[PDB]
Amino acid sequence: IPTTENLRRSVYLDNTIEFLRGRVYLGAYDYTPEDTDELVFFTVEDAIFYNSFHLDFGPMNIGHLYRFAVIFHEILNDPENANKAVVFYSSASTRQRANAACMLCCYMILVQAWTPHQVLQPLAQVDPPFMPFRDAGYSNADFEITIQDVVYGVWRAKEKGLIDLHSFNLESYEKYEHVEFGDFNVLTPDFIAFASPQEDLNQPFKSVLNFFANNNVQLVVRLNSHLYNKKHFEDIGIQHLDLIFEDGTCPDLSIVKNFVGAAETIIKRGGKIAVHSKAGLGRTGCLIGAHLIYTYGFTANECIGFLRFIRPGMVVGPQQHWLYLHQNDFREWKYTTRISLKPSEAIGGLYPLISLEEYRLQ
Amino acid sequence: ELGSPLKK
Secondary structure: OOOOOOOOOOOOOOOEEEEEEEEEEEOOOOOOOOOOOOEEEOOOOOOOOOOOOOOOOOOHHHHHHHHHHHHHHHOOOHHHOOEEEEEEEEEOHHHHHHHHHHHHHHHHHOOOOOOOOHHHHHOOOOOOOOOEOOOOOOOOOOOOOOOOHHHHHHHHHHHHHOOOOOOHHHHHHHOOOOOOOOOOEEEOOOOOEOOOOOOOHHHHHHHHHHHHHOOOEEEEOOOOHHHOOOOHHHOOOOOOEEOOOOOOOOEEEEEEEEHHHHHHHHHHHHEEEEEEOOOOOOOOHHHHHHHHHHOOOOHHHHHHHHHHHHOOOOOOHHHHHHHHHHHHHHHHHHHHHHEEOOOOOHHHHHHOOOEHHHHHHO | OOOOOOOO
């Protein structure tokens, strides 16, 4: 991302929202507006594409946002546009307007240090409203997250040091999200989420193995039935743990507590945890989401929004309501549990969460 | 159709 002016009288356009007076606007048009001597318009809908699983349509992800930032800064830095207001626009559907609005908000949060109430004021009570974001599963939608949720989640993640666009590697991000290179994303400095490898090694499996070996993965957690031989991870010195539960279900809290204990053990030793389910989205979202809430105090909606900003489609169907209804439990564990000092066979000799009582006995 | 969706 090239350097640009660090973010004049107002201009007034229909179907346009003012973000920065005289300089940054958000439009929605079903035609191509012509540039004037006072205005320059641009859209990324012809170049930046959300790849839907089913009926999910957004939000746009961190790689989309990074590419938007490059395109935006090139327009802002053009001497031709020195005394023009820049109008970022989308087509007029409520879904594409939601994507463009949320992506401009995430830009201002991550690149220009705006705060949530600053980026949300321009969008509040817009008529027609933006389409709320739905999950990626195949059932009828019954849980929505909003731009407010995504903005707060992305902002909180940035504040906690989980997002850093200065070190973000777009080419690595884009490569490894491909099915043929392993379908994974580095979610945070501590966590990778990935689709299960498959072994009848194929190219996606070797990509995962080499990336994991070179990027300090010290624990692989398997949440779905066996599609590969775990010996290949052990061959490169990475511990492998099963915490399997049924596709499309929510984990018993005992599973979540064991996962959080396992992850804490690995993090305190300075390693990453790579978690997979079949798709690396649903069951994986339940467990990593719980740990993020436990660690950083996200709301459930923020957590879902942040997770999908890095890896679209995480937390599927009823798992959304499950995360929502248990977010207090995950947060409460910081005060009601401790990392045990006895290893546990249930998590491969790592240290599980135990109550304050059993900790006093130890 | 209740499971995780397929990337493709």
